[PDB]
């Protein structure tokens, strides 16, 4: 599920990935959104490739990295799994995901007027 990553702030619009084809006028600059729609695994792949040591071993470590946009995984790679690492970020709950217990547990703070149209 590398297609459902979430950026903080306005990084989808502000963040830019720049490359060069080597030819005159071959300098390209796209935003994270443009790259994500074109390659749903490039953002996560480029962040990891920049965190690995700047040496010859890095391209060998990236062959041992397997990215999939959706939750589908091949059988072979799915038969040799061992452990699932916990998500670092805790996904907050939408207001439609709270049960009627927590909603009534949280107290009301103010008393709206009865003559208000709202």
């Amino acid at each position: 599920n590398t297609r459902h990553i979430a950026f903080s702030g306005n990084k989808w619009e502000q963040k830019v990935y720049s490359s060069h084809t080597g030819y005159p006028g071959g300098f390209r600059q796209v935003t994270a959104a443009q790259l994500h729609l074109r390659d749903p695994v490039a953002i996560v792949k480029l962040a990891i490739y920049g965190m690995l040591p700047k040496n010859l071993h890095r391209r060998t470590m990236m062959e041992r990295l397997h990215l999939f946009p959706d939750e589908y995984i091949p059988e072979d790679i799915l038969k040799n799994l061992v452990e699932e690492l916990p998500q670092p970020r805790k996904i907050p709950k939408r207001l439609d995901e709270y049960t009627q217990e927590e909603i009534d547990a949280f107290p009301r703070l103010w008393t709206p007027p009865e003559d208000y149209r709202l």
Partner: protein
């Protein structure tokens, strides 16, 4: 260098010192000259020091060959078969008395770089670490997102 030289791991000869200590120095061969200023310090070592040195080390066979020579040498042979040749050219008795004793204390193993300052044949007692050492087991040994009884 280290890269320009060989190396070895710290070791002993026949697990020496484990059950008993056996002196590895096995033979000493001196070559002094009756005449010659180079051998003056070696001649005085043979008059008062060598006899008292043999009393303390009865397992070492000492040979004193007095012959014409310009450079006196002492050859030390060890149980393991190693042979170290050294020169006592123009050395005082005090310098030759500490040298011969150094040879008796050594084991014969090549005097080269030693990789580790320690050696143990049984490094672990609770189990050498492996990836699954500190991992918990799951019910029915299932894998991440594996459908059971399908």
């Amino acid at each position: 260098t280290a890269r320009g030289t060989p190396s070895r791991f710290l070791a002993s000869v026949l697990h020496n010192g484990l059950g008993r200590y056996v002196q590895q120095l096995q033979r000493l061969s001196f070559s002094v000259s009756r005449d010659g200023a180079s051998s003056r310090g070696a001649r005085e070592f043979v008059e008062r020091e060598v006899i008292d040195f043999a009393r303390r080390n009865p397992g070492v066979v000492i040979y004193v060959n007095s012959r014409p020579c310009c450079v006196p040498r002492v050859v030390a042979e060890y149980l393991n078969g190693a042979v170290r040749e050294e020169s006592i050219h123009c050395k005082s008795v005090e310098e030759i008395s500490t040298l011969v004793q150094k040879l008796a204390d050594q084991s014969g193993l090549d005097v080269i770089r030693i990789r580790k300052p320690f050696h143990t044949d049984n490094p672990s007692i609770q189990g050498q670490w492996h990836p699954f050492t500190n991992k918990p087991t799951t019910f029915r040994g299932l894998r991440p997102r594996e459908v059971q009884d399908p």
